[PDB]
């Protein structure tokens, strides 16, 4: 399954992400991919050799824009760093 | 004469910046310091 925050467990390694068809070219024998800080970033599908990405499914703070309650009980929320289709 | 000197001096600044980059060490140092702080913070996650 792709494009959903899933809790994957590929053959050895686990973790939660959003598997997406990538364009990275592993070497024939490599399995993982890592980031500059040693975090999993690409996994080779051990059944069909298509290299998928791993995007940690969106999190982020929630702020509450508000005029003072001395003005009105109305607010507006701000979700930080989301494509605004995941709310 | 003052006009010519001022224009030529601006030009020399342009060149000095365009050729060597170790003049901007001050900003780059801040950016690198924060990048390394974050990288140490993250790499602490892989310790027992």
């Amino acid at each position: 399954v792709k494009n959903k925050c899933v809790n994957f467990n590929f053959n050895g390694l686990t973790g939660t992400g959003v598997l997406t068809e990538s364009n990275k070219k592993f070497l024939p024998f490599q399995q993982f991919g890592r980031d500059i800080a040693d975090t999993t970033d690409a996994v080779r599908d051990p059944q069909t050799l298509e290299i998928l990405d791993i995007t940690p499914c969106s999190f982020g703070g929630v702020s509450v824009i508000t005029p003072g309650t001395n003005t009105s009980n109305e607010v507006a929320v701000l979700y930080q760093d989301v494509n605004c289709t995941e709310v | 004469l003052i006009a010519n000197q001022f224009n030529s001096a601006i030009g020399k600044i342009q060149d000095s910046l365009s050729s060597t980059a170790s003049a901007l060490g001050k900003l780059q140092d801040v950016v690198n310091q924060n990048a390394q702080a974050l990288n140490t913070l993250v790499k602490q996650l892989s310790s027992n």
Partner: peptide
């Protein structure tokens, strides 16, 4: 000349570079 998984959010600066330039 001048050149993510664990809550490390990087907020954006309130004044964007165009407004600084202005």
């Amino acid at each position: 000349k001048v050149t993510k998984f664990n809550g490390l959010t990087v907020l954006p600066p309130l004044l964007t570079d165009e407004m600084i330039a202005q």
